[PDB]
Ligand binder design. Structure first.
Ligand SMILES: [Zn+2]
Length: 257
């Protein structure tokens, strides 16, 4: 069973998931000087006004907030995407200390955390089918730096004590993910993969340039979560990030000059 430790972490994943060594793996370092501005890229359309959050869950690798994706309520369109992508869930990756935690890096800089909003292409009908397609998923990635608090994150922070260990969930209705977005929707994009098993090469990555700021107290609460189930030896859920993978034959494109 895979994880982030010495004996089951990212450098082991290829044994159960050989696509780990594939041609379009994520995350990557974003070399800002090499990314080409693409004037044909559209602004991203984030339509989250009718989002319906359902539950918050500790899945043993991260925590996730899940949405009703049975209709087009919270959708991502435009940008590099063709078609409509439904929001299924968001989750985070973070570090043991503020100098690591993000999956993507920017000129090798690591952020304290990274938010992933996972969306699937409605033309494939369900997420299981979408992960089998090269354009099945769109993941919007947002960097977190530590400074001022993010008010729209606090409702999430405050319930994490109720989902400390793997398998715990709670109701998490009426959460508005618009409160997690930075001012600018300027972005980089590239074709990649899921960053956790099964590492499927089904993702159009959209990584926002502008980080959000969160407070030290907010990120400290992430670090109190446990990878373990209740009753097992306590192992803090920290450093749940995959390192940058080889870019290979890919171009990262920027929406902005
Ligand atoms: Zn992720």
């Amino acid at each position: 069973h895979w994880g982030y430790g010495k004996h089951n972490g990212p450098e082991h994943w290829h044994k159960d998931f050989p696509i780990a060594k594939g041609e379009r793996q994520s995350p990557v370092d974003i070399d800002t000087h090499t990314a080409k501005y693409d004037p044909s890229l559209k602004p991203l359309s984030v339509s989250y006004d009718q989002a319906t959050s359902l539950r918050i869950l500790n899945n043993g690798h991260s925590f996730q907030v899940t949405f009703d994706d049975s209709q087009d309520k919270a959708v991502l369109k435009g940008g590099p995407l063709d078609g409509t992508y439904r929001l299924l869930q968001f989750h985070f990756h973070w570090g043991s200390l503020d100098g690591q935690g993000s999956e993507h890096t920017v000129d090798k800089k690591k952020y304290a955390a990274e938010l992933h909003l996972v969306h699937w292409n409605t033309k494939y009908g369900d997420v299981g089918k979408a992960v089998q397609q090269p354009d099945g998923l769109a993941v919007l990635g947002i960097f977190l730096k530590v400074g001022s608090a993010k008010p729209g994150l606090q409702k999430v922070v405050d319930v994490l004590d109720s989902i400390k260990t793997e398998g715990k969930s709670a109701d998490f209705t009426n959460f508005d993910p618009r409160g997690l977005l930075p001012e600018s929707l300027d972005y980089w994009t590239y074709p990649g993969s899921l960053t956790t098993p099964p590492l499927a090469e089904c993702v159009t990555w959209i990584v926002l340039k502008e980080p959000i700021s969160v407070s030290s107290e907010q990120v400290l609460k992430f670090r109190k979560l446990n990878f373990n189930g209740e009753g097992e030896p306590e192992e803090l859920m920290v450093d749940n990030w995959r390192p940058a993978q080889p870019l290979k034959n890919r171009q990262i494109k920027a929406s902005f000059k």
